[PDB]
Amino acid sequence: EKVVAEQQADGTWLMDGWISIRKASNLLEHDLVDEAERYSTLGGYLLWQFGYIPAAGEQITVDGLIFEIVSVNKHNIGKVRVHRT
Amino acid sequence: EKVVAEQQADGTWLMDGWISIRKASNLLEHDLVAERYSTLGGYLLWQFGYIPAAGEQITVDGLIFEIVSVNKHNIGKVRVHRT
16 A cells, blocks of 8 residues: 655656566666566665664665665665666 | 684584685685675675574584574674584
């Protein structure tokens, strides 16, 4: 009954950390999926990218996508902003 | 200065999550050597597949890793023993 992913008019996405990495990849039109299945959700993917629990504002750029941490909770990354470039 | 790894007489290790996976691998005599510059805390995040809670454990390759604490930035202290 709740929102996992939303896209603004300007094309930016706000996505929940528990979205599957395949769904994130599909929506962002970029294959983020690990061959060896080390991560399964967008939050898991980012935790793997950082190798620690990031703060708000930290970002990773992957193949021209910027992933900005918006919130983090006790069990996963929370809200992630994603935009190109 | 601050202690990154401690062993007890019964063979169990208490390690900081920031400890390198290289050092952990060496101390535990187990090839966890993860992406190699990885840390123990980073390794355990992807083993669990979420940020775990105090008292959770996971068994990987004949080693039991128990989360003792977790802070804002990484897994805090980890307790490791065999089998």
